[PDB]
Design a protein that fits this description.
The radius of gyration is 21 Å and the shape is globular. The longest helix has 21 residues. Helix 1 packs parallel to helix 2 and helix 3 packs across helix 6. Strands 3-2-1-4-6-5-7-8 form an eight-stranded mixed beta sheet, with helices on both faces. The chain is built from 16 helices and eight strands. 51% of the residues lie in helices and 10% in strands. It has two domains: 192 residues, Spore Coat Polysaccharide Biosynthesis Protein SpsA, Chain A, CATH 3.90.550; 185 residues, no CATH class. The protein binds the ligand Nc1nc2c(ncn2[C@@H]2O[C@H](COP(=O)(O)OP(=O)(O)O[C@H]3O[C@H](C(=O)O)[C@@H](O)[C@H](O)[C@@H]3O)[C@@H](O)[C@H]2O)c(=O)[nH]1, chloride ion (CL) and magnesium ion.
Length: 377
């Protein structure tokens, strides 16, 4: 089996450790790191490779991501390049991906996925305990989209559709490398595409729970990712899903305390950020949205406002966005950012602040309400 770690700008020791771990695992045939560009991290790994290959008996290689897609050159190009390397330079049966920034990696992650594949699953997704204000792109953008657009499918049930930890069988990887929609997503949209396409193709999915968290590197640092993940959904909005998928979730443990109590984003800076980067055009664009959202987002010019951005309003807003949002347009991008920011704040003050369990229950019930609403059409 091949284990891939896509990396951009990571601390070498961090990644090297993970490579060590995967290299030492009895079911791993080869390790490939897939870099954005030849940098500090890249050279550090190119160098350590031999010492590690001798120690473990496992080939270890670094390669550069090639431009296989047509959006921003980002993580999608990396993953896809690894897909190509996997299929064209190796004859291994299964491929894993794990983020490079991870600091809680262990052999048991590899084991759990390998054993689930042995059981018969086509794709294995690792999911993790999250803090109640973590993964607001996942919930408010991805899962919501899937719920509103394909309410009868397994799509909105996928726990972490944006997660980069997974395992594919050779044929699944091949199908994905063949898909033009997949190939195109060179940017942060890659993960959404793997999720969408594997489910749409009727691959059988298992999600395994990693009880210890996912420890990696820690609101507007997220802006590109927000737009690109929203773009991905938008680009798929006309696709049809023509078959069911076997889909099963390892039962989750109670969240660890240090994760439930993890700090979270900066509320003050977020509120302040809602009042910044306005332009008249942003203000004319709001004309496209419903009155409460329009009035709401406009008030943010003078002071932060978010009570208006409830569940229903978010869904309204989502539909307007689906139809009018233009990736690449700086005013649309900022506007999506503000809009999503208010939703996040709303969820934080009216739901998350009521407690971990409450917030979790709320999120699942939200998706359900969205599914039912969409199915009535
Ligand atoms: N080769 C390559 N690697 C990249 C690039 N951009 C990021 N990476 C690597 O991709 C991983 C994820 O990057 P990170 O900055 O840690 O993102 P984050 O942890 O916030 O993202 C989570 O949600 C994303 C969504 O989608 C996922 O892509 C990601 O894997 C995580 O599940 C890390 O290993 C990065 O080094 C790129 O342009 N090229
Ligand atoms: Cl997220
Ligand atoms: Mg990260």
């Amino acid at each position: 089996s091949l284990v891939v770690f896509p990396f951009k700008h990571e601390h070498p020791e961090v990644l090297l450790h993970n490579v060590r771990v995967a290299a030492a695992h009895p079911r791993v045939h080869e390790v490939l790191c897939i870099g954005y560009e030849r940098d500090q991290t890249y050279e550090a790994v190119e160098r350590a490779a031999p010492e590690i290959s001798r120690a473990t008996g496992t080939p270890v290689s670094v390669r550069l991501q090639e431009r296989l897609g047509t959006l921003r050159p980002g993580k999608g190009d990396g993953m896809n390049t690894a897909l190509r390397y996997f299929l064209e330079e190796t004859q291994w049966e299964r491929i894993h991906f794990y983020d490079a920034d991870i600091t809680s990696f262990g052999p048991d992650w590899i084991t759990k996925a390998e054993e689930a594949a042995d059981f018969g699953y086509g794709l294995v997704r690792h999911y993790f305990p999250r803090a109640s204000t973590d993964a607001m792109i996942t919930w408010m953008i991805t899962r919501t989209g899937f719920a509103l657009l394909w309410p009868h499918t397994e799509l909105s049930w996928i726990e972490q559709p944006l997660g980069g930890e997974l395992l594919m069988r050779r044929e699944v990887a091949a199908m994905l490398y063949e898909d033009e929609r997949v190939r195109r997503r060179s940017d942060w949209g890659i993960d959404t595409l793997y999720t969408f396409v594997t489910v749409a193709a009727g691959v059988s999915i298992y999600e395994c729970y990693i009880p210890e968290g996912k420890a990696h590197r820690l609101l507007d640092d997220l802006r590109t990712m927000l737009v690109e993940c929203f773009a991905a959904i938008q680009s798929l909005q006309h696709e049809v899903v023509g078959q069911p998928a076997i889909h099963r979730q390892e039962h989750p443990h109670r969240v660890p305390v240090h994760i439930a109590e993890r700090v979270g984003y900066d509320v003050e800076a977020t509120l302040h950020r809602l009042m910044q980067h306005w332009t008249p055009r942003q203000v004319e664009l709001l004309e496209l949205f419903t009155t409460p959202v329009r009035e709401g987002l406009r008030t943010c010019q003078r002071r932060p406002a978010f009570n208006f951005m409830d569940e229903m309003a978010w869904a309204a807003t989502y539909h307007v966005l689906l139809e009018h949002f233009q990736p690449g347009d700086p005013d649309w991008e900022e506007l999506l950012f503000k809009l999503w920011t208010t939703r996040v704040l709303n969820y934080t003050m009216t739901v998350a602040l009521r407690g971990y369990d409450y917030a979790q229950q709320y999120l699942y019930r939200m998706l359900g309400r969205y599914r039912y609403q969409a199915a009535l059409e």
